[PDB]
Amino acid sequence: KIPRGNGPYSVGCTDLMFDHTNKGTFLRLYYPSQRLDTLWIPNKEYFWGLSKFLGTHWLMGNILRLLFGSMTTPANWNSPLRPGEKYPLVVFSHGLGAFRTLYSAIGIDLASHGFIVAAVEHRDRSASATYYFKDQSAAEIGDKSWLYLRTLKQEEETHIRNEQVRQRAKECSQALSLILDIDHGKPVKNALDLKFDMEQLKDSIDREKIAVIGHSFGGATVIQTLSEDQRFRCGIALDAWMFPLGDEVYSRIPQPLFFINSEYFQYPANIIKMKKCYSPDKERKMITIRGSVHQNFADFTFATGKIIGHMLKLKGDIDSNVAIDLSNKASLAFLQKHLGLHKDFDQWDCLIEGDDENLIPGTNINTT
Numbered sequence: 001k002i003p004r005g006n007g008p009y010s011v012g013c014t015d016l017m018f019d020h021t022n023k024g025t026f027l028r029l030y031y032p033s034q035r036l037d038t039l040w041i042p043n044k045e046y047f048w049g050l051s052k053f054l055g056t057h058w059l060m061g062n063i064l065r066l067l068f069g070s071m072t073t074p075a076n077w078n079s080p081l082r083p084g085e086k087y088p089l090v091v092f093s094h095g096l097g098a099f100r101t102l103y104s105a106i107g108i109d110l111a112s113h114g115f116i117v118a119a120v121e122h123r124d125r126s127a128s129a130t131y132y133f134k135d136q137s138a139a140e141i142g143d144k145s146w147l148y149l150r151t152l153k154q155e156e157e158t159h160i161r162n163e164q165v166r167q168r169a170k171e172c173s174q175a176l177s178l179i180l181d182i183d184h185g186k187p188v189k190n191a192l193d194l195k196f197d198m199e200q201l202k203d204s205i206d207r208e209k210i211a212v213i214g215h216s217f218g219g220a221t222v223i224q225t226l227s228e229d230q231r232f233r234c235g236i237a238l239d240a241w242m243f244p245l246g247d248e249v250y251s252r253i254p255q256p257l258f259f260i261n262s263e264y265f266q267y268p269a270n271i272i273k274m275k276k277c278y279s280p281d282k283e284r285k286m287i288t289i290r291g292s293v294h295q296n297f298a299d300f301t302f303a304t305g306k307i308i309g310h311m312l313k314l315k316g317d318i319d320s321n322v323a324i325d326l327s328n329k330a331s332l333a334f335l336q337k338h339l340g341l342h343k344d345f346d347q348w349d350c351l352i353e354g355d356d357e358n359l360i361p362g363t364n365i366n367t368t
């Protein structure tokens with residue numbers, strides 16, 4: 001039910017954890033490859049964590065497991081990397097209560113247009129669930145240590161969310177550094193024991209065409225990561241939740257920055273913070289997909305029927321495939337303009353400006 005990528009490349013998918021601790025990097029890789037069998041949500045504990053995030057008990061955990069536990073996503077698991085070329089790199093940051101696998105609609109479509117996409121799994125305790133290993137012995141027998149989402153008291157939110165977004169930007173940088181090191185032949189031992197050799201990635205990254213993309217909490221991570229890591233050349237923030245960011249960051253984003261909003265998530269206090277990032281000497285774009293809801297950017301907008309997805313706030317008015325296509329095409333055109341790609345994604349340059357029936361330029365919210 002998750003749409004196949006619309007590009008000409010076929011898409012592989014694998015997982016990489018290095019090192020094995022909770023300070024290491026944990027990402028899912030989508031990439032052009034040389035079967036469509038990747039498990040969407042691969043462990044029972046992610047369903048338990050999703051149930052705690054949603055506010056239900058042990059029951060709703062196993063129910064979610066029974067419904068989706070073997071649902072796949074259209075990527076060739078451990079398929080070989082399509083050799084011959086250098087690929088641009090997107091680092092992707094998930095929202096609160098999500099984890100590394102819940103944005104394959106976006107990851108797989110970018111990979112089919114020639115990107116390698118590194119979807120990181122954050123260990124800031126903003127994920128529903130993630131895991132690490134206490135030592136190499138535990139990794140050798142696959143004995144996972146799970147860390148679940150921390151819920152916060154209202155008195156804590158401001159401080160903790162900002163520390164979390166700094167830790168998330170740190171993890172996006174650490175993912176980039178690892179991928180850039182593998183590109184130069186640094187040897188890695190995947191703490192997971194998968195049939196994909198990371199040596200395939202040697203001399204396979206275009207080290208000047210790096211972008212960071214994020215949804216919600218991940219949208220704030222785009223801004224913190226851009227502010228801190230000059231190696232990233234542009235950012236796309238999908239329905240960014242701006243709260244975690246401190247006041248000092250908004251005037252300290254040099255790179256091109258694209259805001260892609262849904263209609264029904266946004267509110268003035270959030271829009272004003274996006275507007276604090278604007279400067280006449282900096283490249284900023286903003287569009288809003290009409291009729292869309294927060295969840296149109298994550299994969300659960302494709303996991304249920306129209307009527308119940310509409311009921312659970314997983315679907316909006318706009319068709320879920322029309323929304324992700326608009327957002328993906330606008331992203332591809334923006335990436336081409338600011339990464340310098342020699343592709344034909346500028347056919348969608350009208351979308352960066354909101355020139356579609358299903359798009360608003362900027363936002364319908366007004367601020368001072």
Ligand SMILES: CC(=O)Nc1ccc(S(=O)(=O)Nc2ccc(Oc3ccc4ccccc4c3)cc2)cc1
Nearest residue numbers: 095096097098102215216217294295298300312314
């Ligand atoms: C009140 C609140 O904190 N709200 C919120 C915050 C962040 C996001 S999120 O989009 O950024 N992260 C995310 C989290 C879980 C996901 O799985 C879901 C989501 C919603 C479901 C609804 C019904 C049944 C199953 C569901 C599974 C997907 C993405 C969403 C809501």
